Design a protein around this ligand. Structure first.
Ligand SMILES: *[C@@H]1O[C@H](CO)[C@@H](O[C@@H]2O[C@H](CO)[C@@H](O)[C@H](O)[C@H]2NC(C)=O)[C@H](O)[C@H]1NC(C)=O
Lengths: 50, 50
């Protein structure tokens, strides 16, 4: 090839470090509070939450 | 007496260069694979600006 200045291209790929803020809604139904609830049920009064 | 006034004549412009593939198909590889089948388009734009 001839003598000259050539503009050769570069390369970079960045797949690391997704940060993902996504505006959360109403947080949870809080069964991490209900399985650990202070009122512990019995088989005679077994408790159901939908 | 002697009067005086000044004038401006423009002799040049800024030299703009364009990376054609990074303008069109910035970083994504599917776009580069699609742009390869257009052939001599980016090369013609680089040649005219040169
Ligand atoms: C565990 O569950 C009980 C009920 O199952 C919760 O007790 C309620 O507390 C609120 C406010 O303190 C009262 O208004 C309700 O009347 C209570 N319920 C009953 C049946 O008395 C309790 O708050 C829960 N605790 C946790 C940590 O989740």
């Amino acid at each position: 090839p001839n003598t000259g200045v050539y503009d050769l291209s570069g390369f970079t790929v960045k797949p690391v470090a997704t940060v993902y803020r996504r505006i959360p809604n109403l947080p949870d139904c809080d069964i991490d509070n209900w399985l650990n609830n202070v009122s512990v049920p019995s088989p005679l009064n077994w408790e159901r939450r939908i | 007496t002697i009067a005086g006034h000044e004038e401006f004549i423009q002799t040049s412009s800024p030299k703009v260069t364009i990376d054609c593939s990074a303008f069109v198909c910035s970083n994504y590889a599917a776009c580069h694979d699609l742009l390869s089948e257009y052939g001599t388009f980016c090369d013609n734009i680089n040649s005219i600006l040169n």
